[model samples]
Target chain A: VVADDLLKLNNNLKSLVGAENPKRLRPALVFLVSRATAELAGLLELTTEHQRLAEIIEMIHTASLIHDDVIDDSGMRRGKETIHQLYGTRVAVLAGDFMFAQSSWFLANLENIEVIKLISQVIKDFASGEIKQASTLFDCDITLDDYLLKSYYKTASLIAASTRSAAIFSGVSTAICEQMYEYGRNLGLSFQVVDDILDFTSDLAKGNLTAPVIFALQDEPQLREIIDSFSETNSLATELGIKRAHELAREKGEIAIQSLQCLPRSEFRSTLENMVKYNLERI
Target chain B: SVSSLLEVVADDLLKLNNNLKSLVGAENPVLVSAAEQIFGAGGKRLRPALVFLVSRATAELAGLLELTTEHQRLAEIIEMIHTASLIHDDVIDDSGMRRGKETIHQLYGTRVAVLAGDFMFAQSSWFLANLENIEVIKLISQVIKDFASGEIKQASTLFDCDITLDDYLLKSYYKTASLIAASTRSAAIFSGVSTAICEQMYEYGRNLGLSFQVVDDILDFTQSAEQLGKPAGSDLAKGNLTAPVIFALQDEPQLREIIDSEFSETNSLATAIELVHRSGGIKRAHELAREKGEIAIQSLQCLPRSEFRSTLENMVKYNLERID
Candidate 1:
């Protein structure tokens, strides 16, 4: 029943994207979990509140994705053209703002001060993270800890907050809710790490550098030396090294798995753990 | 001496408002609609009041006070400047509610809301460009610079726990006091007052503004949620370290740690409010405001004793009773 509601939400979101048929990934992940939480808690049986919350989360995530495309200057998302690429940047910004307004409408009704505060903080963190990333782009000296914090802010923070908020809305115990939050955090981190790994390994021509390649550059000084040398001499070699970094990241995917040992075994933990593995296996 | 003249200035301000509405209405319908809602919500109109009061105190009106088209045009321009700042201020604060109603950004999307602010700013500039008083225009533009820099500083320092009271006061002066100072001093210029009297009006408005914001920070803690029309202590939640919070930190130094630390998960709102209350920050802020209020009243002594001056003095007294 929750799934049906989210399916409808996905459709509404696609309409907002101005896509007759939108390719979906980020929004799908968001809706899937929201629907799963509602189903697990029997929210559909009790109230319509969970369905609305699901829609809100989906809108917020989708809006952020549109804005992200503009910021990142990406050409494709899911399998369709990016919003900024499709509708001009101006319309994209307006659509994102509209989604944010819609999300606020839902959030305002939750009657949970803490949740409201958390979501607001999440928005701040997301913007700050993006700014930091922009500031550090192509700088080789950015530390592992810096990269991790950026990942947490840019990707993991919202995801973790969304999942944890679902538990809170379900009236879960504080302990259980906290564990759920940790599970989401670890999962989100691992997922991004794997994505970073794929940046080098994937056949796509984007030639992006993933986090593992970034970390591996430090371990293999030759990679850094080569990158810096190419920075002045050979642009092709620099691109090659970035691709090689992704290859190195594929080898480092195990580290993400190791981080998950901090959490106990449960469906939530398993889902997070498997998602990280899933990203690697797909590439 | 200055207060009676303020009444005349107030009448001018009403006319300025009408002019602004018509200008915005024609230039940008959506933005104008939003601005209408915000303008109708009604603020204390303290900024415009300072402008008129300064004009009166200077008695420059002897030559300049004629109901000339130029004077009316300048009045409207200043008011538009104030309106533009308010629109941007609402967005930066992320305030959902304002003046007992939903904020413009809440009613309209941030894109439209931002455009509305930009339109007002542009209109103010257009108005100034056409004005004959170049010096007054220069002074107002400088005030805008101070206001923008203050806003940027505030944004950079947000959620920063180490901000000092001096830093807070200076930023507040730049953001709030500088604008009011511009209004007051510009009025004096328009009225052709002496340079010394114009400077005095600037000082008076600045001090009164300092007192005004200090009281507002104190009331954030003192006012109940219902009275505030939103949750009390909302600023704290948004990581805005106001004057009261800065003072409170002096007594309960541990609060600095609590705020800086990631205590959002463990800390309760009640616990946070208790810390603010126990630190004596609110009371200290009140004392500071009263001190500033006295100084504000004293600044008006430079003008001739008259009903307008008396009214200005009464306004300061009214400020004290307002937030309580």
Candidate 2:
């Protein structure tokens, strides 16, 4: 099963980056999109190179999460103590660094200039996204465009890159390649908007301005006063914010589903389209 | 003089200084200004300079018209990687000042510093991949890994006297020499040199960097606080066992006893410093540095006679001169 291959790749990385425990959300997307693209291109199955691309994508995401947990100073992540929480900041930083370097090393070994540059930019975008988020913290005047841009950098970039790079490996036409890029971008944006919605409806970091808050800021300017006046949580404005965010998430999901109109009707394409529906079900 | 020797590549260095800030781009003003502040502070630019020097030296032999885009970008990437590591080091060590200016972490905070370093590392890797040469990409990538390994080794071996000369050299190679060796060898590789010659460039850089590290360790004992810009034996006091401490411990048992106490007693660090000098540790360390210096010089014998080669030779001599 793919589970064994996933564990094997994670183990391969653990030997190099020196970490335990890993995730596969981005990697699964990588596999799905890659196999889907390969199927569309008339290939019977995925190649070893495509498999390696999935591994590299997984490693890059793991690297970003490790550093992010350190920067956010979170004690627990994914239901376990974070790397920095267990190993201290020094080791955490180095461990994350090792992962990035090791990932870059394997990425170069793939020798596909397009894929190399694609994944390489994701690394830069990860940090740029963090820097952007840090500067914009607690700013009530933030725009939806600004929120989307930051979301693109932080959450959508790697997903878009992973999906597009998967298509690139399929050696498909430029039209098909670019369509996958848009599909991934819309899919990622929808996924991020849903996450921000969850943060509002359930519990969240109070300061960071997500899609819901940005939406609420426009309709309810008094919401700014609510935030600035040191108001308590779970206000009426919060409910409206989550509702608007849900609307925005659905719009993105619709766009993602539409992006698949170019692809031929098949089970792979069907599943790819259904992923957006599954994402919106959370809202 | 190192300044006079560097004059051969003065224009290249100037181009690097001017172009370095813009390469990081204007993603965030804070990140841009942070990079500008550090690049403007004017560290020695030693690694990039070596890259340019080796590039030109090998390019001339290879009969290339001038430095390739790959060569120039390699130097830029090397400096960015080095600067990124500096920002991360300041955060990890919790120190304030660097290169006569406030560190990124001290000025902005740990969060920004960590993010900035990560950005640079990622940005530089992007540039590395754009070079489109798998060999050089793999080479520089290992340097980044070596840096983390060096930090881990240093942290784990702190306040311990059982570290051997080989262990010390390996750690020093990881911390200081790995990038230098990579940069030098990579420059030659880009020049289309023979494997033998490219490897010699690596050897030259490896030995020279090790020599510089050893001499730096010696000066901690020999230099004044004003001369050092910090307290003498500060590295030692922090439990970082360097060359002199590693060497002196071989002959001096009481020195181990004091270091084992972690400098708890009054003047314990000063006592350790005095013992390091009195026990001929400085002299033996100078000998080891000179030995590496000689090997570094020998590695350059493959190169044709030129000002570049001489500057490279003088670099090793300049590093060795610190002991005297």
Candidate 3:
């Protein structure tokens, strides 16, 4: 629904991902969490306002993706050429800004100050996250705390905002809203950890040192030398490292499930729980 | 001088300057430093000055004793939006100097430059949302969209000699006039002014901004490299057809042929520049700018006579003064 709405909006604005299929993961989270909270609160269906929130989140996420591709010099996103790759950096940058502003306009029209402030903070977090990663590239001495902090900024912020905003739209209690935020945050952290492990297992990567690499450095001090010098081989990635990272992800997934305890046992709640477990199966 | 014209808004400008760095309070030190570099380099703060000027002028009509916090915040957000665009534009153009200081990209590298601009843009939006005026929010938000549309239009039309004068002016409105128009009208809306007065303020800003842009393009042709701090025909070299070039293309068929060739021949750019002057492009462009200035002045007649009103009038004339 978010993708179709974004496509309809983009058809009029010509502003984003042109026939380039997107994951729309963040908006789905918004919808699922909003539905769960709404169901728990005795509402049978999601409101149009809640649906609009999902669209707005995806727009912001797509805008950041466009800019990230430019910064990373990435040529492909999903399976197609990126906006920057097809339109040049100048157009790509403009397209990204247009999406951000356009989505913001929609976000403002929702007329919910709580949701507005919550989601607007995600844009700032995205930039801060990008800056953190750029500054720490190949710095080998980064702690697990540092890694999680960056992950929160980059991956978990929008997720947290989306889920909390879902609860807010449901008119749920503040406690439930906060619980949704924690649920989204921990799930996002686990999701990012799984992605990092894939980057190690698939033998592909950027300069970005992820959770697996961070854990490996804890066991073998010699791995830091290999990372600092920079090699793409399997030396920096070890079985112990992958195992510790899996434990870390499981720990996060556990917390995510704990946050879902506040919700009644509906399919939406069950799906939310399954989301955490679904992330761990790839290990 | 425009300085004298903006003197009534000096206090607003000063407050904006003092608080600019604090407004972008990102936790990352590197992001903070990159954003600070451009604010410290010193621009005229023209957008915020217009925002304040219009705010105070309309406040007089609303019977307000002073500007509201929303008004002050609008001024700051307008400036932040302008500065963020500058940072992104520099990186897009791969420019080295901005306001006589090294660009953020040159100093901090392109990645940080990109992130810094994004931070400022997001920060400005956050501030804009907090203003809590839905009408003003929608208005200012459209300006951000206009900026990209303006850039995309320019990029798509590069080296194309068939672009109409209306096309050129529309792109100009997107790049320059849209924000100014939105900011000024928002000022009136916050002042609790009537719809008629708000529309007039929008008209005033639109015309004044168009006049300013025309005059700047004229100077791009008339001024030397030392006076312009860059090459005189740099825009033309890059296939940017400004007001002067559009007007010049009217009488000079030879200029179109040269431009369509993308200046492949040696000294074609030099010849194109010479033709623009020789065919009286600058003269017609100067007349068009004065015409917009007159319209800008006319739009302000709806307001009562006051220092702010007079200063707004002088701003239009001050822009014309560049070409004169």
Candidate 4:
């Protein structure tokens, strides 16, 4: 079901670009989830403020994905044609740009300098992360720390910024904002791990420094040598147990759940715990 | 006199340029080169000059001798936004030459081009947000929005004859005038000017920007490809109907058939250019540009006179003199 605020943000976007071209082009897995995520933090219902904050978060992610479609040159998105697929590269490129403009417009309206500053880093992180991924493609010697940091930028950064911005908007203590950000950071790591896991399970493996392969290469030195050769074949060819990658994801998800204990017991905190469960359960 | 104004702010412009170079050196050396190649091209740095000149002129009139750090950063930020747009525009237009050298995408691949443009925007917005002035931030944010809508309007309307003068002007405002307008107004707003004067400065920049683009359109027909740094008759070649083509359509009715047929003739681009040249298009376009320059100058009457204001007038003279 569509939340009221998302509808308003949708109308905001329609007026800026149009109602329908990128409307079809927008990736399918989506946001009014931000409203629920916002409610997970505070007792007092700043219902409208939280909703728009959520909208900005979701919009940022949307803009990032829109650009990702162009950068990745993926033929399909959300089980349909990519923006660059039918629209041509020019349209696809500007599709992301226009959304970014809309996101920034909404961001300016939020009027919290700290939130704006915190969230803006996500923008920097996304580009740098992508550049890192492309530059390091097919390299066998990348460290686990390198992989995790890049993962943090591409996957966790925006989500971490989102929850942290909510804390800032709620006028919470600095301690609380940091804790929420930590929770998001850990949970974000878990989601990317699961995405990597899914890639190995499917035939359409990306094969570029996934978690299980990283785990296996750490143990078996020879696996690193064959890694490039066998990349086109299956799964780093069972370098690690699919079982082990799942364990790593759960471990991170549990840690994400642990960060929430700092927040006082509330229904929203419980909802957040359920969110973590949702994260790992998908694996 | 425009040179005189640049001389006064030459130190700041150098600082602004260095700040841009240092900012792109984030994370990786590869990212820096892909980005720097475009910024390294022979840019006149006109947008930053707009920010620097307007900010200093307005502030100097109020007896402030030095620009705040914010003023310097604002100038750099405007150039970053312009640079980012150019990187993306190259990928969009598939152009080989920008300021007489290879574009970013041509030198690096399209992948780097897309990310490099985005990296600059991220850096630009990061700095804009850090300025901590919500008002200026809001104003600059709208310029990004205008750029998108403008580029979108241009992309959607290729070879379109139904495009009216209003359509052309509105598109030009979004693509070009919006950034210049916002930068000029932002300079005044940050420098402690009245809202009324800031409004006039914005109007000044807007009219100047429209004139600048009009002259650019005129040159596409009249100048050599070497002079223009891209193909001669490129806009008509790309099916972009600028002021010359828009006005020329009034005199040569057959040009409409060539355009309507989607510019598909074996010699369509050359034919189109000849038609626009034969008609009074260039002259009428020049008249409109001079009208805009006059309006732009007239808006500056409210500004207290200074050597900087004198240079501002020369900036107008510089634009109009380009075609003549």
- Model 4 residue pairs with clashes: none
TM-score of chain A of 3: 0.83
| Cα displacement (Å) at residue A106, model 1 | 44
Docking class of 4: acceptable
The best candidate in terms of DockQ: 2
Off by over 4 Å in 2: A1-22, A41-45, A71-87, A202-205, A229-241, A261-267, B224-232
Ranking by DockQ: 2, 3, 4, 1
Worst lDDT run of 10 residues, candidate 4 chain B, spans: B1-10
Model 4 lDDT tens row, B1-324: 345546756777787776667876656877877666767766788889878888888997667888877888888888889888888886777676888887766565556677778878768878988888889888888888898889988998988877888998899899888888998988988888888998999999999999998998888888887876765666887779998888989878888899988877688767778898888888899988899999999888887787668777778888987732
Candidate 1 lDDT over residue span B1-324, tens digit each: 233434645676676566556765543345557878777776556665655555555653355545445445666666777776766676556566776777776565544555555446545644554554666655665666566667767766766888988898888887788877777777767677678877887888888888888877777888876575534676776677897778888778777766776347576556767888887778888888898889888888888876657767876777677753
Q: Mark the regions of model 4 whose C-alpha exceeds 4 Å error after superposition.
A: A1-44, A71-87, A202-207, A229-238, A241-244, B1-5
Candidate 2's DockQ = 0.43
The segments of candidate 3 whose C-alpha lies over 4 angstroms from its true place after superposition are: A1-5, A8-22, A40-44, A71-87, A202-207, A228-240, B229-231
Q: List the residue pairs that clash in candidate 3.
A: none
Per-residue CA lDDT of model 3 for A1-283, tens digit only, reads 2245587543532222222123656766777788888877788877877777877887887888778866443222252234335646666677777778778777777778777777778888888778767658768778898888788888887898889988998998999999999998999899887887776673323467788777766776676666566456656444337777899989999999999999888777777788888789877
Interface RMSD of each: 17.2, 3.5, 3.6, 3.5
> Can you list the residue pairs that collide in candidate 2?
none
State the lDDT at B315 in candidate 4: 84
Compared with the real two-chain complex, what DockQ does model 1 have? 0.01
Backbone clashes, candidate 2: 0
lDDT of 4 by residue, A110-202 (tens): 777777777777887788777667656657777767777888888787777777776666666678678778878878888887887787773
The whole-model C-alpha lDDT of candidate 3 against the native structure comes to 0.80
Task: State which candidate, 1 or 4, has the greater lDDT.
Answer: 4
